[PDB]
Amino acid sequence: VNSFSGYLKLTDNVYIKNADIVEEAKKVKPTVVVNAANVYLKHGGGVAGALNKATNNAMQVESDDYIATNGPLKVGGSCVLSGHNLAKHCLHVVGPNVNKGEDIQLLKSAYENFNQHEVLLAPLLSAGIFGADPIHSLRVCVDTVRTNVYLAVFDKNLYDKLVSSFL
Numbered sequence: 518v519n520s521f522s523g524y525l526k527l528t529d530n531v532y533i534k535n536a537d538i539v540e541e542a543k544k545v546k547p548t549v550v551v552n553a554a555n556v557y558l559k560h561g562g563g564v565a566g567a568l569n570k571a572t573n574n575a576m577q578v579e580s581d582d583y584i585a586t587n588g589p590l591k592v593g594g595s596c597v598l599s600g601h602n603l604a605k606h607c608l609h610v611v612g613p614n615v616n617k618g619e620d621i622q623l624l625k626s627a628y629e630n631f632n633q634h635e636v637l638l639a640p641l642l643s644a645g646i647f648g649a650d651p652i653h654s655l656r657v658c659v660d661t662v663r664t665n666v667y668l669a670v671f672d673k674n675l676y677d678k679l680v681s682s683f684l
């Protein structure tokens with residue numbers, strides 16, 4: 518038993534809810550919140566800019582030190598950093614950005630990072646300003662992640678379409 522509330526159960530291990538992932542993180546304080554990161558950990562917009570804003574830019578300060586030491590991530594890759602005031606840890610995961618021409622097959626590799634954590638609060642990878650089809654992203658999530666994932670979908674219209682179209 519965990520503290521996530523109001524989710525619809527899609528499979529044995531995947532749950533979904535129309536929710537603002539920022540508000541959901543502040544309320545649950547999960548062990549892991551997933552960020553929709555880019556390879557430079559430049560948290561400008563979408564899910565990343567919102568999570569970073571909620572940390573009063575501390576996420577960006579930590580991220581800049583990470584990149585100065587380690588260099589950029591790979592598309593499909595991840596790193597674990599602090600969750601600041603939102604979670605114990607933030608798993609920064611880089612899904613492919615269709616608006617940069619990146620290979621959508623990298624979406625499965627991106628979701629594989631979630632399997633290193635028993636429970637996660639997450640957005641749909643590559644959705645939103647990353648340009649992929651969120652229905653496809655949800656399908657890859659369900660077919661790739663084996664650990665317990667609580668997906669937060671900001672847009673109510675999309676959530677209903679995601680729910681109403683799910684096989």
Ligand SMILES: Nc1cc(NC(=O)NC2CC2)ccc1C(=O)N[C@@H]1c2cccc(O)c2C[C@@H]1C(=O)O
Nearest residue numbers: 537538539563564567640641644645651670671672
């Ligand atoms: N830019 C944001 C900002 C926040 N939250 C705040 O700003 N919270 C502050 C405290 C009030 C949450 C989500 C977002 C955000 O980009 N969503 C995206 C989106 C939108 C429409 C269609 C989509 O496919 C997607 C994929 C993303 C998602 O929903 O995962």
